[PDB]
Design a protein around this ligand. Structure first.
Ligand code: NI
Ligand code: NI
Lengths: 67, 68
């Protein structure tokens, strides 16, 4: 069974760093409130499956990572 | 700038999912533009030293990840 195309070490590193970039953006004024309102809207979208812990941590201001 | 002590598989999976959540937020009206503005203000900030490639891929709309 071929090795992963998507969830790869290089790609996990790239997402880690790009997530740092976006995270500083989310803390900007105006943007913060909109991210929050978006998160409140999205937890009720059943398009996401298996994402419950992450939505909660995001909604409650929990640290991104543990540690 | 990090020793990668918390760069663990569990945390990588967590950051993966969260970044998917945020990615859908960026596609909303207004937010993509605001994000590009932010990145433009941000390019010459020595806050992102060592982030150059990621920053550039983000600014030029290059894919989030590399399929191959
Ligand atoms: Ni609901
Ligand atoms: Ni510069």
């Amino acid at each position: 069974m071929t090795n992963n195309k998507y969830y790869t070490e290089e790609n996990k590193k790239k997402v880690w760093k790009k997530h740092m970039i976006v995270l500083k953006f989310l803390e900007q004024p105006g943007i913060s409130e909109a991210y929050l309102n978006y998160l409140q809207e999205e937890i009720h979208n059943d398009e996401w499956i298996g994402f419950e812990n992450e939505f909660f941590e995001e909604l409650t201001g929990k640290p991104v990572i543990n540690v």
